[PDB]
Design a protein around this ligand. Structure first.
Ligand SMILES: [Mg+2]
Ligand SMILES: [Mg+2]
Ligand SMILES: [Mg+2]
Ligand SMILES: [Mg+2]
Ligand SMILES: [Mg+2]
Ligand SMILES: [Mg+2]
Ligand SMILES: [Mg+2]
Ligand SMILES: [Mg+2]
Ligand SMILES: [Mg+2]
Ligand SMILES: [Mg+2]
Ligand SMILES: [Mg+2]
Ligand SMILES: [Mg+2]
Ligand SMILES: [Mg+2]
Ligand SMILES: [Mg+2]
Ligand SMILES: [Mg+2]
Ligand SMILES: [Mg+2]
Ligand SMILES: [Mg+2]
Ligand SMILES: [Mg+2]
Ligand SMILES: [Mg+2]
Ligand SMILES: [Zn+2]
Lengths: 125, 98, 80, 24, 155, 206, 127, 60
RNA sequence: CGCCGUUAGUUGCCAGCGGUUCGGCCGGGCACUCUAACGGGACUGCCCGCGAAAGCGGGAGGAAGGAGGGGACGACGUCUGGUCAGCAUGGCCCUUACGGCCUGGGCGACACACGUGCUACAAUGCCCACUACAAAGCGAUGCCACCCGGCAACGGGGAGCUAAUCGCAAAAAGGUGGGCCCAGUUCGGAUUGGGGUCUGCAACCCGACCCCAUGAAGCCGGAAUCGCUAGUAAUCGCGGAUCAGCCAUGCC
């Protein structure tokens, strides 16, 4: 059943399945199960309607998940850029932000490589 | 109950205490617990053999500190008089807390 | 995920120089070298000319940039 | 792995403590 | 080994069957020096063979290893142009080393999730004469005596 | 690169340290830095007396300071003028009452520190290297010594290309700890540049 | 009445005490199968006893200190062998041939510089 | 190093943070041991002249 | 480093015992372990085969055998090798600066490329819990026990230590039980958002750490290429030097 915004994890432990929800991770999961007394090991397909409702009414009225969360984050970074912020300019360039060395290994933040002229008449190492 | 600690960078110089202090009364006055060795804290200084590069060279230097306990119950009048100020070692330090 | 504890820091060079302009009016350019100072509410409106190691760049302070440091709005290195 | 901060071995390696590794 | 002839290092006999060959197999299974986890796997396999076969486990192991030993193999060698796979006997020392190694290798190719199950079913398949471990042996033998046109290069 | 200081290599045996005195982890660096201030000063003043090794000891806030020279005469001073002011400047650095002593060197031709200091003075004084060295080794070898060796660095003769001049006699088993080999080094500030001078003297075995 | 033997191995030391008894082994307070619980090697330590058809002829109180259970397993096997020769000197004609008496001297080789792990040398490229 | 820079014990360095070791024998500010006040080069030099009490060459 | 002995027992222990808050915690002996000073022990010494001899194969006694294992040690010299930015040092050049002083910036730039490494791609694994074993080292204007508050980083409190006598410490791989069930996954933890601790005059450029959220590439790597012969490789974790703190996944 749908716990969080359009969420349908089934055939798995509740505390694991819950993770598939956006803003929900291992912590929030095993936490929402304790504050609603739902045996974490139980499979979603084996949950009481009564239990699901509790989970639904809780997890949604306790945290800010899914799309609405993407919205805030998408919004936050956009804010960093609108103002002349530094981290902002970094987000514009697509370069690391948490002060990482960009002479090498900035791949994850730069996507596939953009190999161009790297040498011509000197040690090509 | 005489407790005297013995530090030092040389282990033969410290011995210039046991074979000198236990000569008062080992089987007459006090019992003299004798000089206990105790572990010896070692300090290593590892250094690159030469200036500039050559990280894989290095030479090792240690500054071994030796210890001694002694401890002698029965702070005898005459026994202390002798074992009072008749020493010789220069590379030894003493601590007293009997 | 920033952090400074409990005791927001700002260099009194301007901290005491700004609170003054709040006793008269605005002011054009306030060249400083203190990019350490966490911009405080009582600055919005003022135009602090932060230094970049080479020049003083004017940064109009807005409600939006409260807890941000003056340096963050004054880029240092020059890329393409 | 030793790279997971919020895990047991993650803290050991990084030589730290927290919810994922109390002191006792 | 340019100087010494190299001497085989005998190993401590088995702590069950007492067989030294058994220990050897366990060493191959062992990785990162986790001997306990290793043995805990081999013996776990002997249990899996006792229910699958009415015959004792050691009888199976012996058989398996034996089936997997190659009688002949080819060893590259330049003779005056390109490289030439020259067939030649395999010393008893090597037959053993290879059997055990291959056994453990094919073993970890099987789909079964539990390690012990992989070694067990693999040993059984070996004594039966089937199983990918016995294939390698067959393919290696098929390799030589398929180059008999060079066997006169003993080496 | 090769070849470790032959003393640093024997410090343990057949070569007692040059300053015996314990010192906790907190004071040591100080008591040590002081040794230098001292060893340095004396080394510059007592130059003409020609010193070998300034040994130093320490006690209940005390300081040995036993300078080993060949011309104690010049050390002491006339009736005690040299040996005077020295303890006046020494005790200033060390407010621990620094006694001071002077020892005689039983022949300065078995004192590598000197033999080297010798050849060095010759070179700074435009002498012919090969000869000074051949003589030095001789003198050393002349009075006992089961072996000896002298080495001068480069620019031998003011030349543009630096070189190294050998010269040695008897034995000098550097690879044996049980050797008791004295070692001495001396610069040689000249008009064209420096020139190292190392001196080795092999005396006694076990 | 009671026989002793030292026994050491690769940084492990264990005192062994044998007394004509049943067979229980009070290792560091716990039963044998309790201290070396689930380690296919333990049975080794007790091996020397089987060298002379003893085992149930003795009892053994053992205290270990230093190293790892496996290193200790061997140290223990050395005590159970010595304390046995003290019980009977003639218990060497058998207890020895199997080697049970030799003291395994292999030790963690020092860690040299310019090398990662003592011998394991760092790797390079152009060469 | 340069003489101008030699002055670690300059005292009152404004903030304890700006204070830095520096060799007492050569001015080297790059690998000065606390126990000796010296840099790794000098530590090697003097130790060879047994001028560092008790400091011997280790070996195990 | 490997075995034994002697000398010394505020480490040690039911050894045999008596007191147990049944913790070697008090008594108390130092036997054993250990600590460390010193000392013994192997020398082809003995037996057998071969040998002209040196010595080679093999055997016994022995902790150890024939260089028992690991170090320190590196010849005459070569590379006109490295370093005048450690330090000296000849020559040359600079003066109102090629000196000095600061605040700030830079050495942390990035379309690219390589070396060395870390962490992985998972089930002989990952997670959680309980529980057993080290060594070598560290403790001031420091190491910080059992206490309280906080999920926590850590904050307040405060004992002992001055350190074989207190602390750092929890060793980790391991073992026992449970979970996961082959999935880009309870594999991996990159990146990014948010909140916060601490060190520091100060963390924007440029710190480490904690918690929530996010959860990338990666399914074992082309040509080619590296280390290692035994307590070695591989694998696991611990300490230290530098050091306020830390970019150490480095070094020892
Ligand atoms: Mg080399
Ligand atoms: Mg070397
Ligand atoms: Mg002012
Ligand atoms: Mg994980
Ligand atoms: Mg001139
Ligand atoms: Mg190791
Ligand atoms: Mg200078
Ligand atoms: Mg600093
Ligand atoms: Mg003994
Ligand atoms: Mg009792
Ligand atoms: Mg002979
Ligand atoms: Mg040699
Ligand atoms: Mg750099
Ligand atoms: Mg709490
Ligand atoms: Mg399990
Ligand atoms: Mg692989
Ligand atoms: Mg690895
Ligand atoms: Mg540090
Ligand atoms: Mg570390
Ligand atoms: Zn220096």
């Amino acid at each position: 059943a749908r716990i969080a915004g359009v969420e349908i994890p089934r055939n798995k432990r509740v505390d694991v399945a819950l993770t598939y929800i956006y803003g929900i991770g291992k912590a929030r999961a095993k936490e929402a199960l304790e504050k609603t007394g739902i045996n974490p090991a139980t499979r979603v397909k084996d949950l009481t309607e009564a239990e699901v409702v509790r989970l639904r009414e809780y997890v949604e009225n306790t945290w800010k998940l899914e799309g609405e969360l993407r919205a805030e984050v998408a919004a936050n970074i956009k804010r960093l850029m609108d103002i002349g912020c530094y981290r902002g300019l970094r987000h514009r360039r697509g370069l690391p932000v948490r002060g990482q060395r960009t002479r090498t290994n900035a791949r994850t933040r730069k996507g596939p490589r953009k190999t161009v002229a790297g040498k011509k008449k000197a040690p090509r190492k | 109950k005489i407790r005297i600690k013995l530090r030092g960078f040389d282990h033969k110089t410290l011995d210039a205490s046991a074979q000198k202090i236990v000569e008062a009364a080992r089987r007459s006055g006090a019992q003299v617990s004798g000089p206990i060795p105790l572990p010896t804290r070692v300090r290593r200084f590892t250094v690159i053999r030469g200036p500039f590069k050559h990280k894989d060279s290095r030479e090792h230097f240690e500054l071994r500190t030796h210890n001694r306990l002694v401890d002698i119950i029965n702070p005898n009048r005459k026994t202390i008089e002798q074992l009072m100020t008749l020493d010789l070692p220069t590379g030894v330090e003493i601590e007293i807390k009997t | 995920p920033r952090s400074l504890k409990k005791g927001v820091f700002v260099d009194d060079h301007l901290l005491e120089k700004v609170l003054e302009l709040n006793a008269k009016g605005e002011k054009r350019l306030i060249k400083t070298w203190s990019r350490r100072s966490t911009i405080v509410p009582e600055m919005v409106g003022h135009t602090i000319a932060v230094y970049n190691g080479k020049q003083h760049v004017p940064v109009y302070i807005t409600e939006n940039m409260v807890g941000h440091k003056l340096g963050e709005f004054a880029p240092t290195r020059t890329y393409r | 792995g030793k790279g997971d901060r919020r895990t047991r071995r993650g803290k050991i390696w990084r030589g730290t403590y927290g919810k994922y590794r109390p002191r006792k | 080994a340019r100087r010494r002839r190299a001497e085989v290092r005998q190993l401590q006999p088995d702590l069950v069957y007492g067989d030294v060959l058994v220990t050897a197999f366990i060493n191959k299974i062992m990785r990162d020096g986790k001997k306990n986890l290793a043995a805990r796997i081999f013996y776990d396999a002997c249990k899996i063979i006792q229910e699958k076969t009415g015959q004792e486990p050691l009888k199976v192991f012996k058989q398996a290893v034996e089936n997997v030993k190659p009688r002949m193999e080819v060893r590259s060698r330049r003779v005056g142009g390109a490289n030439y796979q020259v067939p030649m006997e395999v010393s008893p020392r090597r037959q053993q080393s290879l059997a055990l190694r291959w056994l453990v290798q094919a073993a970890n190719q099987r789909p079964e999730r539990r390690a012990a199950v992989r070694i067990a079913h693999e040993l059984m398949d070996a004594a039966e004469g089937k199983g990918g471990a016995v294939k390698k042996k067959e393919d290696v033998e098929r390799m030589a005596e398929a180059n008999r046109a060079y066997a006169h290069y003993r080496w | 690169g090769n070849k470790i200081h032959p003393i640093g290599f024997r410090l343990g045996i057949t070569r007692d340290w040059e300053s015996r005195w314990y010192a906790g982890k907190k004071q040591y660096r100080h008591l040590l830095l002081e040794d230098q201030r001292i060893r340095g000063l004396l080394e510059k003043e007592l130059y003409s007396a020609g010193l070998a090794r300034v040994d130093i000891e320490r006690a209940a806030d005390n300081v040995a300071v036993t300078v080993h020279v060949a011309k104690p005469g010049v050390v002491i001073g006339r009736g005690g003028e040299r040996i005077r002011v020295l303890r006046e400047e020494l005790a200033k650095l060390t407010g621990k009452n620094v006694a001071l002593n002077v020892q005689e060197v039983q022949n300065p031709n078995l004192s590598a520190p000197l033999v080297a200091q010798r050849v060095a003075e010759q070179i700074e004084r435009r002498f012919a290297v090969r000869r000074a060295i051949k003589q030095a080794v001789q003198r050393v070898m002349e009075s006992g010594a089961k072996g000896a060796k002298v080495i001068v660095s480069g620019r031998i003769g003011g030349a543009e290309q630096a070189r190294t001049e050998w010269a040695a006699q008897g034995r000098v088993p550097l690879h044996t700890l049980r050797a008791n080999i004295d070692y001495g080094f001396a610069l040689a500030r000249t008009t064209y540049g420096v020139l190292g001078v190392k001196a080795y003297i092999f005396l006694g075995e076990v | 009445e009671q026989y002793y033997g030292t026994g050491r191995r690769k940084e492990a030391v264990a005192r062994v005490f044998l007394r004509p008894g049943n067979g229980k082994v009070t290792v560091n307070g716990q039963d044998f199968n309790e201290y070396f619980q689930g380690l296919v090697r333990a049975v080794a330590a007790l091996e020397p006893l089987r060298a002379v058809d003893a085992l149930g002829r003795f009892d053994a109180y053992i205290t270990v200190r230093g190293g790892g259970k496996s290193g200790q397993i061997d140290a223990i096997k050395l005590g159970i062998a010595r304390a046995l020769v003290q019980y009977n000197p003639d218990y060497r004609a058998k207890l020895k041939p199997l080697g049970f008496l030799t003291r395994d001297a292999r030790v963690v080789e020092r860690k040299k510089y310019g090398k990662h792990k003592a011998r394991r040398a760092p790797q390079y490229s152009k060469r | 190093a340069r003489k101008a820079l030699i002055e670690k014990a300059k005292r009152t360095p404004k903030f304890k943070v700006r204070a830095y070791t520096r060799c007492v024998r050569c001015g080297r500010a790059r690998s000065v041991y606390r126990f000796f006040g010296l840099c790794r080069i000098c530590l090697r030099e003097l130790a060879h002249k047994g001028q560092l009490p008790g400091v011997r060459k280790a070996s195990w």
